[PDB]
């Protein structure tokens, strides 16, 4: 079990501005054998099943607008959204994947200001 | 193009059993390691159980250990989640998820099912 | 990759169209043409080599054609 | 260590000259040819009378 | 694109290893070998053409090699 | 009409001679070269005396 903490629990940003979310782990998520940090990020649109945005941290899943970008290394990771649209409202969920009992972080939210 | 559909969600009194079926299409189902996922309303997503590509490497979470059974049937392209000793806390909408096609983790989520809600009360 | 070795000259052919007849008819010649358009100097080299290795005229033309067709084809 | 990727598109080019057949139920193999001889000796015009 | 006209030979190279020098180094040679071993019949016609074009041995041999390298890859 | 599949791995050896890059945030290239003039006029060594 890994305690996952997201710095903001609610973000109000006007359109055209960047919104950043910090998810800090409780232990190291870096798999020593390969040297890859195994973190994941999911967006659950209002009344929809969540999709995937950032597999690992640097990488980005297909079918995803280029604005989303993952950052950070060693238990403190961060997303960035260069331009926020009306469709970016949702419930961003950072989850670790290193250890088998996968634990999501508490759900953050992003509402248009 | 992947399509995951759920079935089996219904109202039930505590203690009684229920089996949840995840029919999948659009990919070779037999060469994958399916997961189960859930989320109570107003709460975050919670992991439930995993069945690997080889049918003999099942795992479950702590809060649901020794109470749930996960099983795949390759031929019928469905995922069976037999849940016993259900309680009003365990009720939630259940999501059936796929594995990561591109990546290194043996366990990850590419695509989420539509989602079925199971209601538990007296 | 497997994108090479097309199922072209096996000879077990029928009346109906194959997988990509119209699309795959001119693929190789288009590739050679675009390579020659991209890299012009190899034409000069091929002319020189054919002239200094070809005794007659038909031999010159044949070896020049073979070189210009093999180099993009070879890679 | 890197995995190469999906070979579906590469194979779709590798099959350039191969014929195609429907595969909805069983295999309805089109694009064939058959020779046969017609006995055509027991037929009747049925209109002569 | 289709796995034709690869990136080799363009330049812009340095000491760090390129993408697939491990595998793509011998790929074309292996393709030519397997095509020749799967269609041995064309060798006779290649020899015929080489013998009927060329008044010497040097151009005979080079034309033979050029046909044997054009036909499988240009396939 | 057909879709002709996915060329993701089909172009994955069409791009075979080039050098790879990282493209993780800032795109470090880890390749190429650079020339420089090392005018070593003000670099006196330590502990001469
Ligand atoms: C390939 O790479 C993957 C990458 O994940 C490896 O996946 C591993 O899968 C195993 C499952 O077989 C994971 O085991 C889990 O380990 C947890 C570690 O917990 C701590 O470590 C010690 C060391 O044993 C434990 O004893 C302590 O409990 C520590 O807390 C462990 O907590 C977890 O238990 C879970 O399952 C049991 C059984 O159901 C439950 O009772 C328990 O409550 C909990 O739900 C598992 O035992 C392992 O963690 C995974 N790897 C990593 C890095 O996390 C593969 O093993 C690699 N190899 C192959 C061939 O796939």
Provide the structure class of chain C.
mainly alpha
Task: Give the beta-strand count of chain D.
Answer: 0
Could you tell me the radius of gyration of chain C in angstroms? Answer: 16 Å
The fraction of residues in strands of chain D falls at: under 5%
Major sheet size, sense and barrel closure of chain C: none
Q: SS-based structural class of chain D?
A: little secondary structure
Largest sheet of chain D: none
Oligomeric form of this entry? part of a larger assembly
Chain pair sharing the greatest interface: C-E, 28 and 27 residues
What fraction, in percent, of the residue positions of chain C are helical?
55-70%
DSSP summary: helix tally of chain C: 4
Task: Describe, in plain words, how this protein is organized in 3D.
The structure is cut from a larger assembly and holds 1 copy of chain A (113 residues), 1 copy of chain B (122 residues), 2 copies of chain C (75 residues) and 2 copies of chain D (49 residues). Chain B is an all-beta fold. Chain B contains no helices and 10 strands. In chain B, the strands form 2 sheets. In chain B, strands 2-10-9-4-5-6 form a 6-stranded mixed sheet, with no helix packed on it. Chain B has a 4-stranded antiparallel sheet with strand order 1-3-8-7, with no helix packed on it. Chain C contains 4 helices and no strands. In chain C, helix 3 (41-53) crosses helix 4 (57-74). Chain D is low in regular secondary structure and 49 residues long. Chain D contains 1 helix and no strands. The chains are: A mainly beta (113), B mainly beta (122), C mainly alpha (75), D little secondary structure (49). At the C-F interface, loops of C face loops of F. The complex binds a molecule of 5 linked components (NAG-NAG-BMA-MAN-BMA). It is classed as virus/immune system.
Features:
part of a larger assembly, 6 chains, C: 75 residues, 64% helix, D: 0% strand, binds a molecule of 5 linked components (NAG-NAG-BMA-MAN-BMA)
Summary, kept brief:
This is part of a larger assembly, with one copy of chain A (113 residues), one copy of chain B (122 residues), two copies of chain C (75 residues) and two copies of chain D (49 residues). Helices cover 0% and strands 41% of the residues of chain B. Chain B is an all-beta fold.
């Amino acid at each position: 079990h890994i305690v996952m903490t997201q710095s903001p629990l609610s973000l109000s940003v006007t359109p055209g501005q960047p919104a950043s979310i910090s998810c800090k782990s409780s232990q190291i998520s870096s798999w020593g054998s390969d040297g890859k940090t195994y973190l994941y990020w999911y967006l659950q649109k209002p009344g929809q099943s969540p999709q995937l945005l950032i597999y690992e941290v640097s990488s980005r899943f297909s079918g995803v607008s280029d604005r989303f970008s993952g950052s950070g290394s060693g238990t403190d990771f961060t997303l960035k959204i260069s331009r926020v649209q009306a469709e970016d409202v949702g419930l961003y969920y950072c989850m670790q994947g290193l250890h088998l009992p996968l634990t999501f972080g508490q759900g953050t939210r992003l509402e248009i200001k | 193009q992947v399509e995951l559909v759920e079935s089996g969600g219904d109202v039930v009194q505590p203690g009684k059993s229920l089996r949840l079926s995840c029919a999948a299409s659009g990919f070779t189902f037999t060469n994958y390691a399916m997961h189960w996922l859930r989320q109570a309303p107003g709460k975050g997503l919670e992991w439930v159980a995993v069945i690997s590509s080889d049918v003999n490497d099942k795992y479950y979470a702590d809060s649901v250990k020794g109470r749930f059974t996960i099983s795949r049937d390759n031929s019928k392209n469905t995922l069976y989640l037999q849940m016993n000793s259900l309680t009003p806390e365990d009720t939630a909408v259940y999501y059936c998820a796929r594995e990561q096609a591109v990546g290194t983790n043996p366990w990850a989520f590419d695509y989420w099912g539509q989602g079925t809600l199971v209601t538990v009360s007296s | 990759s497997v994108a090479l070795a097309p199922h072209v000259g096996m000879g077990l052919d029928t009346r109906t169209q194959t997988w990509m007849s119209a699309e795959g008819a001119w693929r190789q010649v288009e590739k050679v043409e675009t390579w020659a358009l991209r890299h012009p100097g190899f034409t000069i080299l091929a002319l020189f080599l054919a002239h200094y290795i070809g005794t007659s005229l038909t031999q010159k033309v044949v070896i020049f054609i073979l070189l210009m067709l093999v180099t993009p084809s070879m890679t | 260590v890197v995995v190469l990727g999906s070979q579906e598109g590469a194979m779709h080019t590798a099959l350039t000259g191969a014929t195609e057949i429907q595969n909805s139920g069983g295999t309805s193999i089109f694009a064939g040819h058959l020779k046969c001889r017609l006995k055509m000796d027991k037929l009747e015009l049925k209109g002569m009378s």
